[PDB]
Amino acid sequence: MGRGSEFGIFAFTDSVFEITESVGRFELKVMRYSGARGTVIVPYWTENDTATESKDYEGARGELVFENNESEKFIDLFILEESSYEKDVSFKVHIGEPRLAPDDGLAAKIKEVEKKPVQDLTELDRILLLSKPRNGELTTAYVRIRESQEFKATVDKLVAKA
User: How many domains does the chain have?
Assistant: First the structure.
């Protein structure tokens, strides 16, 4: 906890998304909820499920930098066209622990406090921990990729033809 933060709370808009291998570049929003104060780094990385990195989509890995009044940042994907008649395939994109930018006032003590023993936490440093930039519960997005939806109109009209 708590339910809020000032730095603040980072998550995807939801867990579940669907394209279209024809979409090219897919912008996936990472939302900053409750208080846009400070500059916060958010790590992200891609991972295979049924969709595979060399074929279905290109691998994306890095960090997002949210400035002082930035409440939104986007991950570009990108998604590979392979003119399939039929496909239902999917991959994951995760976000790691958001961290405050090294230079600003609180960066330390936070990194120092958040790796001392819990039974040693002091009243004020658990206030620090409470105020920390945090993840929401939506820290994994699943991206389902489908056939171009009327490539398949078009194969189907062709199939019915004699």
Answer: 1
In order, the DSSP letters of 23-81 are: --S--EEEEEES---S-EEEEEEEEESSS-TTTTB---EEEEEE-SS--EEEE---B--
Question: CB–CB of 41/63 below 8 Å?
Answer: yes
Q: Which domain holds residue 15?
A: 1-162
Q: This structure's resolution (angstroms)?
A: 2.5
**Pairwise CA distance, residues 87 & 25, whole Å:** 18
What 3-state class would DSSP assign to 144?
strand
CATH code where residue 94 lies: 2.60.40.2030
Pairing of β 134-135 and β 9-12: parallel
